[PDB]
Amino acid sequence: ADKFVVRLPEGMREQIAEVARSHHRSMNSEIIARLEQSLLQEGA
Amino acid sequence: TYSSRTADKFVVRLPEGMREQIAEVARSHHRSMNSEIIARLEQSLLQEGA
Amino acid sequence: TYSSRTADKFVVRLPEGMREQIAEVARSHHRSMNSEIIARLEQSLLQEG
Amino acid sequence: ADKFVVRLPEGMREQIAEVARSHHRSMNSEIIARLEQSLLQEGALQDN
DNA sequence: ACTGGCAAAACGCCGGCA
DNA sequence: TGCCGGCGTTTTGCCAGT
């Protein structure tokens, strides 16, 4: 599977981890889950 | 203090052809792939916060 | 070939305060002012057929 | 009036040129008129 | 007007960490 | 799974030279 290194702004770094644990999934699992939701919003 | 060389990098292991899917969106919205990802994350985050 | 350093350049004379207004919305959308301007112009044009 | 040089993609210049000619306006006038209505259009997204 | 191009930023990605 | 220095690149904002 291909990968993309994402330069992230100030806050996100930590804030992204916070939501991951509370969702009981890894960071990469969180980001991709959010990303697919966003892309699904476009299907409107 | 916080440039793009300083910023927090994070490898996102994309599912098959999802990368190509971001790309198409990124082009149409006239932003880099980085900015694309950021913009979507940022918005997804703020939805839960309001 | 047609890169960024090849692209047609047009000097836009902007009215009072439009600059900061555009820059603000540009950051707001995670985009360079250039891309920001192009994006809006583009959408304006196809809206007109 | 302050300046800002725009790099336009392939077909944009001629595209804008035509529309301007259509509206009997300067190219710069056309660009601004459009950038104007584009800004206050989404600036009118204060609760839709 | 135009447009080479500069200096600085951002980009994409590698290849190495832990 | 996560972290990141740093390379080689384009892009970006904005000039001066024509």
Numbering used by the authors:
A (entry chain B): 16 to 59
B (entry chain A): 10 to 59
C (entry chain C): 10 to 58
D (entry chain D): 16 to 63
Reproduce, without paraphrasing, sentences from the article in which this PDB structure was first reported.
In alginate producing strains isolated from CF patients, the transcription factor AmrZ (Alginate and Motility Regulator Z, formerly AlgZ) is highly expressed. The 108 amino acid, 12.3 kD AmrZ protein is a member of the ribbon-helix-helix (RHH) family of DNA binding proteins, sharing highest sequence similarity to the Arc and Mnt repressors from bacteriophage P22. AmrZ and Helicobacter pylori NikR are currently the only characterized RHH proteins known to function as both transcriptional activators and repressors. AmrZ is necessary for alginate production, via the activation of algD, which is the first gene in the alginate biosynthetic operon.
We determined the structure of a C-terminal truncation mutant of AmrZ, Δ42, in complex with an 18 bp oligonucleotide containing the amrZ1 site to 3.1 Å resolution. The Δ42 variant of AmrZ (residues 1–66) contains the extended N-terminus and the RHH DNA binding domain, but has a truncated C-terminal domain. The structure reveals AmrZ binds the amrZ1 site as a dimer-of-dimers, and DNA recognition occurs by the interaction with two half sites on the DNA, separated by five base pairs. The dimer-dimer interface, which occludes approximately 290 Å2 of surface area on each dimer, is formed by a series of interactions between specific residues located on the loop connecting α-helix 1 and α-helix 2 on chains B and C. The insertion of the anti-parallel β-sheet from each AmrZ dimer into the major groove of the amrZ1 site provides for the recognition of two half sites, each with the sequence 5′-GGC (orange bases). Sequence dependent binding by AmrZ occurs via the interaction of three residues, Lys18, Val20, and Arg22, with the nucleotides. The DNA binding β-sheet also orients the residue Arg22, from the other monomer of the dimer, to form a bidentate hydrogen bond to both the O6 and N7 atoms of the nucleotide G12 (G31 on the other half site). In the AmrZ structure, it appears that residue Val20 is poised to select for cytosine bases C13 and C14 (C32 and C33 on other half site) via a hydrophobic interaction.
